[PDB]
Design an enzyme around this catalytic site. Sequence first.
Site, PDB file in Angstrom:
ATOM      1  N   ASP A  62     -12.409   9.674  -7.485  1.00 16.96           N
ATOM      2  CA  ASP A  62     -13.585  10.285  -6.882  1.00 16.96           C
ATOM      3  C   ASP A  62     -13.241  11.523  -6.056  1.00 16.96           C
ATOM      4  OD1 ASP A  62     -12.447   9.229  -4.630  1.00 16.96           O
ATOM      5  OD2 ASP A  62     -14.100   7.965  -4.069  1.00 16.96           O
TER       6      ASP A  62
ATOM      7  N   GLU B  54       0.822  -1.199   0.000  1.00 15.51           N
ATOM      8  CA  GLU B  54       0.000   0.000   0.000  1.00 15.51           C
ATOM      9  C   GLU B  54       0.860   1.256   0.000  1.00 15.51           C
ATOM     10  OE1 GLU B  54      -3.008   0.527  -0.499  1.00 15.51           O
ATOM     11  OE2 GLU B  54      -4.018  -1.396  -0.198  1.00 15.51           O
TER      12      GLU B  54
ATOM     13  N   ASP C  24      -5.963   8.693  -0.196  1.00 14.73           N
ATOM     14  CA  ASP C  24      -5.525   7.629   0.714  1.00 14.73           C
ATOM     15  C   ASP C  24      -4.300   8.141   1.463  1.00 14.73           C
ATOM     16  OD1 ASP C  24      -7.485   6.080  -0.416  1.00 14.73           O
ATOM     17  OD2 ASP C  24      -6.109   5.094  -1.777  1.00 14.73           O
TER      18      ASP C  24
END
Length: 129
Positions: free
Chosen positions: A48, A35, A52
């Site tokens: 959108d 990640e 993160d």
Amino acid sequence: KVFGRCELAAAMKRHGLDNYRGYSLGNWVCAAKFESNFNTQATNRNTDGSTDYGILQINSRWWCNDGRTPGSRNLCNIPCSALLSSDITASVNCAKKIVSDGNGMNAWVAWRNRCKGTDVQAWIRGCRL
Ligand SMILES: [Cl-]
Ligand code: NA
């Protein structure tokens, strides 16, 4: 802060992530690796408009407030900047809420695509935990 593999493993263990909701420590280290490459300062913008944050790439659409994701929830009750700290506590506490959310670790796309079903124990091999 960019954690070393075993350093992160130990920090996560100390924070109670080993076997949290049935997910062994190797799952958490593997998710962090893919990640954020173990970097607490990693940020990535989503299409959108949400972003993160941190070592576990927690999304502003639901879990933290960044002041720029219209109509988003702040389920972890923290500013997203808290997730970039060298101290992983906020990231871990929020991750615990996410993983208990019903979909388990599938909430993390990289875990689902790169860790799930692999030999995740390899991520902690060699560490003095
Ligand atoms: Cl689960
Ligand atoms: Na939000």
